[PDB]
Point group: D3
């Protein structure tokens, strides 16, 4: 139940040791959020990250005392408009977005907000990653990240969750960003999810989900059939199939008995959804009524390490999410050193 | 999870004993379907129904003997084109659909098909219910039912599934029929699911699911917020709320902590979905990877007793589905004693 | 005139290779008008008919109708035929990513229309004729799903209007609700080829409610259809957009639109939508004083034709003669 | 030809009840060869008094080149020099001043024979008009619709008669509406029915489709609904649809295959789903059937005005003018009621 | 002249009301042009200004600009104001079914634009003026979300063109991209009532690129807007569709369109889309010889105006004078 | 002054061509304001006017107006012109697949607007000026159908605002309801070349209600129009999306958007739709205190301009002076 998460913690430790013992600097814009602070007590004990809290230092240190969490007494607290880099950060956002309606006045007002300040910190290398969204809706938390840090080349911003089963994990995407991805977008989501599965030493086997089995009819069935064709043309080395129903996808015996002509054998471990209603409802329902741990969402497709929590998260969910944000920050920091 | 199903079995028996010992006559158009026949061995042993098989008697009896299946030697096997009521049934389908493109030629050709013949048997009272779809896709199996038996007044054809948890069940709909139901259709689906929950002695508490919490924004959030408003005016005695995410819906602690203004307290036990992708994927994923039994889909909104299996069903799934079809057939047969 | 030469043309083909008559399967084994027509067709050695149905029910109808020549016609019940499960597997193989698994294939192959289409596809018959008792959409769907269209073809119905110096070809009278400019050009090329098979020069008009207006909508569409077809067959006279009397009357064309590329009157009329084609051929047939034969299904890989359900017995006879000709043509193409 | 001779006799019969005066029919195409040749017959048969529009010199020159003596004293009116010209300009302006027609536009339009003819009819200086022999239908019909307009709940629609051996068939709308709605197809049907009743015949109406009683999305559903709407407005008539064209006209096909239908004995009024189907059908029947087809006749408009098909023969013009004369006489009676 | 009369009504209003001046909050406490304008406005007893920001950095800007009269001005930092958490709760109460929970409400209320809107909404200020340093959309959204539109109202920007003998009103210059006919009628009525407050008879033109054409698109929309508005205020001259020179020039209208119901020239011009209204007032402002004041936000429940970010120091002075007038009018309405 | 310099260049062009004056045909031979304008224009040796109409009714209007220099003006009645039937054949030749047969061609060619257009097309006149009496759409349609656009040209109206230090050019003020980004760039290039003919460097702003936002709709379209135009004339300053005051005021541009490629103020303003351009130039003309001349039709193969029907007499004089300049320029390009 816990095995995949403690293997992640152990990989964070191996990465820290291979780099002087340094921990990733993870900035939290919600410096007074009760669940973030309670989670950070566990995370600092486990040497997962060096946290940076954003807010008015007096009020963050007020909240830490009311919650009685001494292990954070040293933790750095930064008030955005008083940080020495504020004016350079204002200038950078203006430079990036002056033809997207951000003049100096808009940049100045946005950079005062902790979410924008956290995103620019990560973009500029003043932090290695960020974790936000514990106290506000996903759209408002993710917009600063997409506008500031942006997507890498050909990337698509997309949320991913792991369902931690007994044999294996299953990856679900896109659980957070795209309302109704096109066939081309679902293929790119599949490739992004696939390289994450490969990072963990697993063979990705991809199903494009629908309410139909290999019907190819207009609408969602046709879209997910074409998504699988596009993804296969970009990664012909992977098993990728669709359109198919969700039990057809995960159960190898159903697949073999009913659709043995299919190219997907042994059950899918990457499930790509046709719309945001389906992915968002599915991972949340599994999390609540299944008997498996679900971790995420993790934001993929973006140039730097940045993750948005689901606002319904528990304290333990934040701990799990920061562990994988630390792993992502370490990976990206090593890419930026080659 | 065996308790909710064994209680249904005992209610089928109590209904039979309260009516002369009659068992409900359930017709199965797929007379040679391996899983249907294996299921019927258990269903006859458990005195759930009088099964009627459709097909060529020697091909059906050959399959029963090749599978070594007892208790089916007395079972009625009917070939549609040789049944005495065939031409009357042709006459009736023409009468019903002559301005929908069904002349006598079309009616004769359709009525030779077991799925069409089974539906007319139920419509005309020659059977008390039917169960189909073990060997063909849902759209093709459900179309004869909707075209022949049709919806009751203001009903909407809609599939419903039960998730049987340890302390409660959850109802999911519409898992099979409507691709993208309107706000008005999602209210009617909720009302149909609510009356099913009440038949089992439980108070229904209804959530209109979205990827959003009380955002009411254009698109799905607005549709599901409005669907809850319509349903509240139609059943002002019930807790009905939306738009909300799936974990907000089922977890009473999340709702109270984050949205205490909501009218839904104590957790939803009826989940109404915004489109068929989300509902169909969700119940199949829960069934495969959750550790709870999922029964259904059950076709609601139709004038007579008729259910379509998921073609991915197991034999035990068919046994479970027929138990509840028997209950529906007994209930409708007793309403028709007015 | 035109029909008797076609009948002789079937006999000419039979003698030339094998001596065998084309095997034509009729899925509607109990259809009264089909059975009455087959009395004439067997007497004239047009085809070896294969009827689909329950043998005893088909034999009751033949006896009840008192038709003597059908005493030993072959009658086949789909589910009992030795090739039934082979046909089921083939349909699954063809359509498994179009929603047809083995369960769907078994259910469909028990239906005579599907079984007839597969018999022809597999070479167990040389052609089929259906649609005497059901609507065209339901009769043609199994053919298109099983046999399919040839490379770059478009399924399209074609009718012949038989005047005294002339025949006119009308298309597409049955399939496409609202064909695009590209589709109307392809329909034109398919019709032009049938006309050439009968030794006639095809002269094609893309019909509209307009004369060379080129305005948005149907006029622009039919103007472009003629341009596309001209680029694909630069050797033919093809013109549009033009009205129907402009198209067929060489005098109106010369007097009012001498700049047009179509002179001497069109004998191939391509229609802009299915309302116009379907109503027009049926009205000419009923109230005109010319015989109309067809519709004939063009663009498909094997020989298969769907009757209009309003057909007379004599209309079935005419349709089967040309189905036999198509079957012989395709069957001889399929050796080389 | 029986049906045409009976119409000719009713024009004379109507003339006898009013002093012997003939309807004044204006022809804007004063130099059109086929119009002039047709008028020689029409003046001979006392169908109408024609009024030609143009330059008197060019019109009388053309009459002389074709050697048609019976037209050497027909009235010729040049729009811009006629005494009512400035009055006509003011009227078109008064009618269309919030439809983009000012005094400048009205002066320019009224100088054109088609507009001048339409206004002559609108103002009672003529009893009817016939145009469209030399220009496309759209340009000929637009001045009529803009000047005279539709009567209340009316719809502009062209109608043709197929004169069979023992009935006529009415086809509509063969000229105006590209793609009428179900509601418009109902109104076209009612307009055609009242014309059929004028000739002493019972109207039996079919809404044509490529389908028989399918009711499927698109044209089948539209023509099924057109029949329902029209039936509610004239519950005394047989009106049915959707149905195919041979189903509609052949009583034996209808009785054999669709005995539940409300249309028995065959339709004599065929209402078409779009302009492609109606325009092609009447032209093809006219060219290749062996029945006479007369029209199109413009229905739904407040005064008598018809537009010929530009492909017309001289005898077609003669046939069309006879029924325009009848229409002109009918409207002149109502305008005294 | 029109401006001295507005100032002078603010003064009469302040008189007879204890000497009280309207409390106007400016969220942009460090904005150079806002501070420079306030030197003139407090000097002239127009308003008691409240500046939002970090007090220490606002006084820093005031000293750099050498404005000694602003030393005693009230400066409020949103997050430390005693009512801050009360304001958070109010926004949550208003917008909890529009996606604003306590977390969102608390984050938004820390922003000066949101804090100013709530101050006005709760009666802690009598009006607000924003938008000198950020785009109009970002400045107006908090006002629309917090204060909202009154019943049947439409949010719409309005400008006055102050000519020598008269003023012209233009709307909607800021809010609606492409108003419907119904919205353009409601905009006309809102502007008409403002003109009546200044003692003038409103004469309304619905502007288009066409004169009385009524053709599909913009001509039909503006013809219909005038018909709708005429039915709601039949006592007023309201006409359209018409071009802009037809609208303002009584001689052109009389010479070319004497049938029109608009005589004596329009003084209210309602535009068909935001491109036309926004470009028009700015171009007249830059190259004409007339003063243009505004835009003024109409249709909202309390006094709140958004500057054009291109404003001069005089523009801000002009705008605040009329915001003060609006604030005083509203405060009396809320006194019954 | 700008107009007086134009008149002098007409004379300088005339002197260099043997003293010949351009032949300008006016289809509105009886239009009061045209006739009064021609009194000034013939006195100023601007053009040789040709009036269309009935020679008797035209001379009847001239004498009643008392215009002595018009005594020997050429007056042409289209149906009586010796080239009439040649012109009918030419219009038929051009448009026979656009719905114009010989009958339509005869009827249209009898209309002065069509006849005036064909005279210019065939070289029987050097230019035409119409639209004093009728709406712009009806006046411009014959020109576009007969003369047409030069290759890749776009028909577009242009107006000059004659300011004190400079002029501003506005387009497209008359033709395109809602030009695409690609069309807006082409309008910019045409306007740029006219400004260069007057010896001035064009600086182009793509106008919007937004400043450099690039948001969907008009902002994105005008940002993209500027990008396309820059790639076609990399030597010019061309920028967008921007508001109208940002565009014309160099101090606003430098203070608020110094990253912009446009410095020193735009003198060419390209509008996003016809509502904005048409209302703007008419409002500036009526309530600004600067003269506005035009509209002038650009993008067409020959010299032809449509007046605004609301024009004054002095406006027609101004318009004809520049039509004369265009006619003279075009005649030496056609001597290649």
């Amino acid at each position: 139940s816990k095995v995949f998460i403690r293997s992640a913690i152990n990989r964070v430790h191996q990465n820290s040791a291979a780099n002087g013992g340094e921990l990733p600097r993870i900035v939290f814009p919600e410096g007074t959020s009760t669940k973030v602070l309670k989670a950070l007590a566990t995370l600092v004990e486990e040497k997962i990250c060096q946290p940076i809290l954003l807010g008015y230092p007096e009020r963050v240190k007020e909240k830490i005392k009311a919650l009685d969490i001494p292990l954070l007494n040293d933790v750095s607290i930064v008030h955005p408009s008083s940080h020495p880099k504020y004016f350079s950060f204002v200038e950078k956002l203006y430079s990036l977005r002056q033809r997207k309606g951000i003049n100096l006045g808009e940049a100045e007002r946005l950079m005062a907000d902790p979410n924008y300040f956290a995103a620019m910190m990560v973009n500029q290398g003043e932090a290695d990653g960020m974790v936000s969204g514990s106290s506000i809706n996903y759209a408002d938390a993710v917009r600063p990240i997409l506008q500031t840090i942006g997507v890498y080349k050909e990337g698509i911003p997309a949320g991913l969750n792991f369902v931690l089963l007994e044999d294996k994990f299953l990856v679900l995407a896109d659980t957070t960003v795209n309302l109704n991805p096109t066939a081309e977008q679902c293929a790119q989501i599949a490739l992004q999810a696939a390289k994450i599965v490969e990072y963990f030493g697993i063979e990705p086997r991809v199903a494009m989900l629908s309410y139909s089995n290999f019907s190819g009819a207009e609408g969602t069935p046709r879209k997910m059939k074409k998504a699988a064709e596009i993804a296969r043309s970009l990664r012909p080395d992977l098993m990728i199939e669709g359109d198919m129903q969700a039990d057809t996808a995960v159960n190898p015996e159903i697949m073999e008995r009913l659709f043995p002509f299919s190219g997907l054998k042994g059950g899918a471990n990457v499930l790509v959804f046709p719309n945001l209603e389906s992915s968002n409802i599915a991972y949340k329902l599994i999390q609540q009524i299944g008997k498996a741990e679900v971790i995420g969402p993790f934001l993929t497709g973006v140039r730097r390490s940045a993750n948005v929590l689901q606002r319904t998260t528990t304290v333990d969910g934040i701990v799990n999410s920061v562990v994988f944000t630390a792993l992502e920050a370490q990976y990206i920091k090593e890419v930026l050193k080659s």
